[PDB]
Design a protein around this ligand. Structure first.
Ligand SMILES: OC[C@H]1O[C@@H]2O[C@H]3[C@H](O)[C@@H](O)[C@@H](O[C@H]4[C@H](O)[C@@H](O)[C@@H](O[C@H]5[C@H](O)[C@@H](O)[C@@H](O[C@H]6[C@H](O)[C@@H](O)[C@@H](O[C@H]7[C@H](O)[C@@H](O)[C@@H](O[C@H]8[C@H](O)[C@@H](O)[C@@H](O[C@H]1[C@H](O)[C@H]2O)O[C@@H]8CO)O[C@@H]7CO)O[C@@H]6CO)O[C@@H]5CO)O[C@@H]4CO)O[C@@H]3CO
Ligand SMILES: [Ca+2]
Ligand SMILES: [Ca+2]
Ligand SMILES: [Ca+2]
Ligand SMILES: [Ca+2]
Ligand SMILES: [Ca+2]
Length: 1054
């Protein structure tokens, strides 16, 4: 009122000094600092460095002497200097650097492509590294709103670097337009002034990554709720009111400080009460929300302006009970900072609980209706207990996929192939194999994404699968008509048949199976599905009918068949760490359309949605997304009876967030198990991440990569010859070397430390003898510079040697096994590999089909490689090995080593698969054959679990583990044995154990029953108590328990 007027510099927008003529380019330097006059700031010291050579070669005679300053401006006007630059051809690009003497002003070897600016007349500006098409663009950028490095973090606090040490600091706002300069070049919209302040600790706690930011203070009476209705720009100016900078404002902090407290007390979605249906959606910044209501054929039949609750920021409307079954969306009117527009669009409900086909509309549903439950649903019990640490330890997971399970199975009814309902085909090969796996002690099926994914089109008409005519492929995929496979549109054979014919002439120089499959991938039904569209509705394409609630009942039918007929618990993979899209445009941007910039994690400076996850990084560190997650998990827990959840990329989540979620779900069902996967994150600066280290002692499990890398060999980044040289314990590291490896005995001995430690459950405090005979705690064994042991209890550790991502176990072994290793040796290598997991104290996890030697033709990342490369054949003809070179984009640089190694031995057939299945069932039956394998508690494991054959002079590749049921340990947990010995001999030599001489040790009953089909076939226990172990074998032995408890196998104090 008294205030200085903030404004542009009173000078017109500059035109162009010179346009370039033929064989010329022109470069303007827009001296912005000078144009707010005073000094004529001489331009003779200004100069260009121009050099050609690689990348850009269009200049005509570049002065390559770096010091030579002589290339000074051709002329100047009041807006600065400019340069006329001769060229060779005028189509191309040039390399330029801009300098004040040998000093320098644009921290970047900048470049001028003539393909963008075809008049070759561009402008730049001291500091910016951008290349503008005119001085006016540059000038406007210089004085226009840019980036979004202002953070309105609570009601009275704005963190912003742009305002540091500036007299005028203000928050401008326009409810309905962009904030911009006047007809008079002034900023006339309303504003609040910001007084410099010091940030506080409540906000330093909340935003540690922003704590070095200049803090600014808002009058205690600012009408916050009105500022968040529109656009909010932060602006800084000098004493004359001329603008220094202006940026957009990230508002997520102040939205939580303002509304989260009230909004967490509310329930969301379309909710059947007894008064009818209540709709509520959280839209704290929206200007309008209307509830549109749709007919069965998707016509508008009502549109209701909703009631905004001023405290929560949530919008609600109460309607009739006849809205049950109606399709609906929210018609939003809302400012989006990305587009700087008050957008208008219809968004489906992020709390949707049912959907129309391909998720176009959300649908009012009562999940409690018996109409959407299969008969007996409410009685469904957990076939396996999860209460105690010992209960959880017995967990043995089968990581599976809806289409992997049934797509190829001719014994599944055609219409159920690739569907939730394939699991009811009680006499299919797939289902009876799973029933057998369960019988032998697989306990858990883990489901790859069955929530609503984005990346399969649920309109069946727009989708062709390889089991269908190839002409169907051409109809729905127009790229096919314009490719080397066009001839097959009339062939009258299926895509499956065409792919089989392409095997014959397929090689590293004719990778044609992959070439056709790549196009199939775009329009088939196949995807892992790590692409969330709606978090709390079943995927529609796995239903026999994706329109409406059909999927809800079919899914639960599937859940029933796994728990009741199959006798297994059920785990869901869940992806709360990202969304499929953000912004106001994209079909699958849901959350970021309704409350823009609140649900995604943004770069502190630009405000861009980060993509470290792959995609649109979500922001689970914000309260209303934490609630969304917990409410979502609750529905899956209560309404779908899911027994546990695997968090994808769990370290992009705050530890406190996961724990808070777990407590909410423990409150509904105390035995639900939580675990997740995580290795990169790099979000440590924003909060304490949900990582392997930090989660110690919480009871949240994590995939361990330690044993995995030690038994598989190498790591996930390997390519080329490293895939072969990096043998593991499972593939003969240092005992049966191949022709390329260099692994020393020490390197091999270290892998074995990682593997014992993992078999004892990868505890930090478990004490063992290392490769050099030194005493070490699990934390003290090294895993690529990190402590190897990180857990408090073994139930915090999930062990595995194969998984959906990266190469399958069989393919790793094929990469790494010595040529002399024959097929049966490779089969036992698979079995010994898996024994380190199945006989270990950690939770046991494994890829569907390891019991069938599953291959993906060396495909490392098969998320989109279709029915073809992920084939699992429950008719036991082969293991899908050698069905073509894998996709070139991701595996092309491995074609050389593949062709070199691929044909060392024969492709596994029915005999080998059947042999492997028995090996597998033997191991899992052993895992549950005695409680000593699954002690549960970490203090119990240290007290009872020990190793032999340790130290520098160990027999390489021979793991000997003891479990004690004797007196030094406490109660006899097994009323049949006093102790157990697990001997895994991953070596070509036979080995003899003397540690148990004259002690009445004996082979386990399970292995003795399997005869010469046992992994222990050929093991002899002498009367003097020595044990002979055949090459490549796994033996489990027992101390028989007498009339009272014996002395067992006490752990030594090291
Ligand atoms: O998200 C990434 C990744 O995370 C997980 O891996 C973790 C792992 O479990 C930990 O043990 C550890 O990783 C260490 C690793 O095991 C060691 O081998 C070593 O790695 C070094 C390599 O030896 C060395 O060669 C080099 O790596 C370079 C590669 O040679 C080069 O090709 C490129 O890497 C690219 C890959 O080739 C390419 O496949 C792709 O990587 C993807 C993964 O394959 C995919 O599985 C997933 O990776 C997860 C993995 O599943 C987890 O287990 O996504 C990846 C997307 O990037 O793309 C790569 C990028 O171009 O560049 C690297 C440059 O380093 O150096 C490495 C690093 O020292 O030490 C490892 C330490 O990281 O931690 C990781 C956490 O990432
Ligand atoms: Ca131009
Ligand atoms: Ca879907
Ligand atoms: Ca696909
Ligand atoms: Ca970051
Ligand atoms: Ca006992």
């Amino acid at each position: 009122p008294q205030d200085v007027v903030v404004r542009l510099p009173d000078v017109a927008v500059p035109g162009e000094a010179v346009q370039a003529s033929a064989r010329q380019a022109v470069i303007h330097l827009v001296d912005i600092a000078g144009i707010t006059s005073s000094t004529p700031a001489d331009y003779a010291t200004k100069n260009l460095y121009l050099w050609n050579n690689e990348t850009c070669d269009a200049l005509s005679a570049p002065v390559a002497d770096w010091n030579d300053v002589s290339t000074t401006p051709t002329g100047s006007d009041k807006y600065g200097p400019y340069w006329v630059i001769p060229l060779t051809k005028e189509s191309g690009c040039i390399n330029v650097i801009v300098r004040d003497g040998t000093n320098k002003l644009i921290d970047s070897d900048l470049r001028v492509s003539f393909s963008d600016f075809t008049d070759r007349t561009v402008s730049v500006i001291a500091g910016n590294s951008a290349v503008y098409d005119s001085r006016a663009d540059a000038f406007r950028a210089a004085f226009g709103v840019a980036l979004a490095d202002a953070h309105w973090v609570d009601k009275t606090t704005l963190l912003w670097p742009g305002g540091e040490n500036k007299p005028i600091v203000r928050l401008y706002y326009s409810h309905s337009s962009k904030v911009a300069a006047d007809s008079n070049g002034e900023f006339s919209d309303k504003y609040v002034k910001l007084t410099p302040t010091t940030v506080n600790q409540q906000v330093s706690m909340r935003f540690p990554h922003l704590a070095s930011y200049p803090a600014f203070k808002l009058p205690d009476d600012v009408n916050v709720d009105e500022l968040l209705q529109g656009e909010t720009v932060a602006i800084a100016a000098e004493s004359d009111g001329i603008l220094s900078s202006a940026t957009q404002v990230q508002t997520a902090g102040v939205l939580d400080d303002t509304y989260a407290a009230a909004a967490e007390a509310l329930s969301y979605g379309a909710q059947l009460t007894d008064s009818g249906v209540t709709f509520r959606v959280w839209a704290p910044t929206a200007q309008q929300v209307e509830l549109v209501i749709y007919s069965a054929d998707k016509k508008v039949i009502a549109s209701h302006p909703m009631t905004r609750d001023s405290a929560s920021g949530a919008w609600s409307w109460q309607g009739g009970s006849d809205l049950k079954g109606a399709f609906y969306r929210y018609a939003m009117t809302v400012y989006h900072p990305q587009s700087r527009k008050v957008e208008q669009y219809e968004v489906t409900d992020p709390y949707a609980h049912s959907l129309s086909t391909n998720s176009e509309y959300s649908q009012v549903v009562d999940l409690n209706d018996s109409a959407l439950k299969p008969e007996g649903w409410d009685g469904l019990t957990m076939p396996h207990a999860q209460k105690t640490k010992a209960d959880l330890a017995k967990m043995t997971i089968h990581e599976s996929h809806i289409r992997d399970l049934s797509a190829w199975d001719q014994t599944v009814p055609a219409e159920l192939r690739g569907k939730y309902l394939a699991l009811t085909a009680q006499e299919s090969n797939m289902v009876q194999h799973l029933k057998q796996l369960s019988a032998s002690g697989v306990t858990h099926i883990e489901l790859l994404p069955v929530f609503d994914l984005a990346t399969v089109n649920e309109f069946s008409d727009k989708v062709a699968d390889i089991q269908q005519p190839f002409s169907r492929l051409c109809e729905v995929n127009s790229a096919v008509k314009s490719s080397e496979f066009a001839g097959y549109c009339d062939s009258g054979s299926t895509v499956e048949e065409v792919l089989t014919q392409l095997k014959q002439n397929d090689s590293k120089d004719n990778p044609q199976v992959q070439a056709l499959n790549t196009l199939v991938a775009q329009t088939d039904s196949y995807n892992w599905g790590y692409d969330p569209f709606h978090y709390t509705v079943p995927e529609g394409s796995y239903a026999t009918d994706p329109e409406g609630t059909a999927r809800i009942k079919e899914f639960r039918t599937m859940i029933q068949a796994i728990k009741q007929d199959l006798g297994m618990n059920v785990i869901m993979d869940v992806v709360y760490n990202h969304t499929n899209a953000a912004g106001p445009t994209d079909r699958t941007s849901v959350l970021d359309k309704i409350v823009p910039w609140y649900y995604q994690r943004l770069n502190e400076t630009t405000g861009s949605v980060e993509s470290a996850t792959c995609c649109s990084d979500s922001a689970p560190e914000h309260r209303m997304f934490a609630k969304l997650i917990a409410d979502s998990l609750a529905v899956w827990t209560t309404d779908y009876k899911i027994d546990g959840f695997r968090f994808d990329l769990m370290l992009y989540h705050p530890k406190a967030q996961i724990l808070s979620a777990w407590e909410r779900i423990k409150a509904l069902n105390p035995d639900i198990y939580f675990f997740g996967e995580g290795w990169d994150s790099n979000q440590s600066d924003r909060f304490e991440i949900a990582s392997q280290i930090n989660l110690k002692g919480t009871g949240i499990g994590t995939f361990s990569d330690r044993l995995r890398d030690a038994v598989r060999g190498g790591g996930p980044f390997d390519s080329g010859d490293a895939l072969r040289q990096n043998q593991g314990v499972g593939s003969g590291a240092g005992v049966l070397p191949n022709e390329l490896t260099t692994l020393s005995d020490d390197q091999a001995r270290h892998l074995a430390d990682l593997t014992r430690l993992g078999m004892a459950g990868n505890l930090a405090d478990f004490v063992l003898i290392d490769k050099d005979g030194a005493v070490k705690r699990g934390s003290e064994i090294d895993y690529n510079g990190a402590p190897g042991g990180y857990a408090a209890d073994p139930t915090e550790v999930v062990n595995y040697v194969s998984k959906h991502d990266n190469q399958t176990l069989w393919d790793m072994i094929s990469y790494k096994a010595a040529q002399e290793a024959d097929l049966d040796t490779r089969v036992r290598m698979q079995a010994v590999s898996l024994a380190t997991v199945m006989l270990g104290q950690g939770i046991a996890f494994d890829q569907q089909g390891s019991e069938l030697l599953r291959s993906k033709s060396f495909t490392r990342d098969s998320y989109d490689s279709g029915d073809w490369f992920n084939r699992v054949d429950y008719s036991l003809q082969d293991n899908n090995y050698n069905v073509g070179m894998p996709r070139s984009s991701d595996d092309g640089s491995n074609y050389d080593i593949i062709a070199r190694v691929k044909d060392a031995v024969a492709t596994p057939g029915e005999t080998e698969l059947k042999q492997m299945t028995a090996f597998y069932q033997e191991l899992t039956a052993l895992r549950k054959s005695s409680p000593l394998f699954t002690l549960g508690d970490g203090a119990t494991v240290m007290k009872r679990v020990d190793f032999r054959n340790t130290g520098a002079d160990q027999q390489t590749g021979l793991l000997v583990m003891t479990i004690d049921d004797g007196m030094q340990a406490g109660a006899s947990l097994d009323s049949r044995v006093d102790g157990i010995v697990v001997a895994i001999n991953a070596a070509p030599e036979s080995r003899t154990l003397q540690d148990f001489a004259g002690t009445s040790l004996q082979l386990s009953a399970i292995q003795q029953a399997a005869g010469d089909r046992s992994l222990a076939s050929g093991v002899q226990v002498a009367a003097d108590g020595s044990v002979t172990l055949p090459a490549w074998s796994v033996a489990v032995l027992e101390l028989p328990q007498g009339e009272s408890q014996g002395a067992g196998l006490p752990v030594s104090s090291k």
